[PDB]
Design a protein around this ligand. Structure first.
Ligand SMILES: [Ca+2]
Lengths: 241, 241
């Protein structure tokens, strides 16, 4: 019964994770867009002292999101929010019940975090070499069940953690968004279209097919336009090695 | 009834995390040291194809750890192992039951992963300036309950995740181990002894006083000697300005 408010921005893959999980939970919740990169509201540190999106408030009196209550719980960090939503809505089965399968989900989220996420960030924002990213993606692909299905078999929060980033990759590459070189843009587009990456393309289609994705995605072109407003994606700059 | 084997190494704070949680769970488990730095056994990629410590096997037939069975579950990534141990031993209450308190635990583990660990890595491996690390530690300190307790109040896996790194900081600094300069080492030692960091000192004391730490720690001098064998810590080497 207690209220959930998610502070969000369309470009943000980290906020996207949490919208997906809230959709999969069937939760009642409010979203509130925050111009975190160009015009942070003076009240925003009251909901997240770290000054990042996403931010979540939970409980307290029902108030407008730009008048946050000191009485709500302030929850930070998108992966903490995913686990919290699974904890709040156990009947939605956002994690498996089997401990080994639950560990597959947690392992997949840690493999993404520790090997892949930083490569996406370095390739896109610093234009570092794309090969290490493709290697990390091949490793992540190898953790998926071979025959189809999601990270832990049934859909879980592990798939909410990863799909925002993989789903952005394809249309960002098609639009030439990111500070990597033309040569590495071609390399990545060819790789991600190659038989080497058939399994992760099926994973992306399977995640995107779910209502939780359709209902939290502005569309490929609209997401590209949102991403173009991110300052660290300077138009017209590329790094070469 | 299903067996647990943890592949470990004394120097490793990531492996230490999991040993602490296994102690707190009251689990029956085997540990097996692997010279992952210098002499990785040919069979080790069968338990962890990422070729890192820690590695875990679960279930399957009881076999010598250097003859791993294809029938055991192979679990990778220390934080996934922590959540797995919590799932396997619910009567041990390694997480709170309340969703908001559980979220404090998950948020603290993500704050450490996303803000603090990388700063420890930069300072210790590259000798980058200490100030950003001290800043990140003050942030993490701020997430603790100011008047006392562990990250989520009661002890949880969040404290298993973080104490290996905080507990190494003090004796590594007093040994001058790491690529930072003597000037930054003095600065860090003074900062961590000052009233600014009194709360995090209390936290380190409180975690170290638990049997789970005593039983998984070789002693400060012994741990320093094991750390001197780590190639990335470059014993005898320091970068300046
Ligand atoms: Ca595989």
């Amino acid at each position: 019964t207690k209220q959930i408010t998610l502070y969000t921005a369309t470009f943000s893959p980290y906020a996207h994770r949490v919208r997906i999980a809230l959709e999969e939970a069937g939760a009642e919740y409010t979203t509130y867009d925050v111009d975190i990169l160009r015009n942070m509201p003076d009240w925003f540190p009251l909901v997240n002292p770290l000054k990042k999106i996403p931010a979540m408030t939970f409980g307290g009196p029902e108030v407008p999101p730009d008048q946050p209550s000191p009485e709500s719980a302030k929850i930070a960090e998108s992966l903490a929010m995913l686990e919290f939503i699974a904890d709040l809505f156990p009947d939605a089965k956002l994690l498996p019940t089997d401990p080994v399968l639950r560990a597959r989900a947690r392992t997949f989220m840690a493999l993404y975090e520790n090997y892949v996420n930083g490569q996406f960030r370095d390739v896109w924002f610093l234009g570092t070499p794309a090969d290490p990213l493709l290697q990390a993606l091949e490793m992540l692909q190898g953790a998926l069940p071979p025959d189809g299905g999601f990270a832990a078999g049934e859909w879980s929060i592990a798939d909410a953690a990863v799909i925002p980033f993989l789903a952005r990759m394809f249309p960002y590459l098609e639009a030439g968004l990111g500070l990597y070189s033309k040569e590495d843009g071609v390399k990545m587009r060819k790789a991600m279209a190659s038989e080497r990456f058939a399994r992760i393309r099926q994973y992306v289609r399977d995640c995107r097919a779910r209502p939780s994705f359709a209902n939290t995605w502005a569309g490929d072109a609209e997401q590209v336009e949102a991403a173009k407003t991110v300052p660290m994606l300077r138009v017209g700059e590329h790094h070469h090695h």
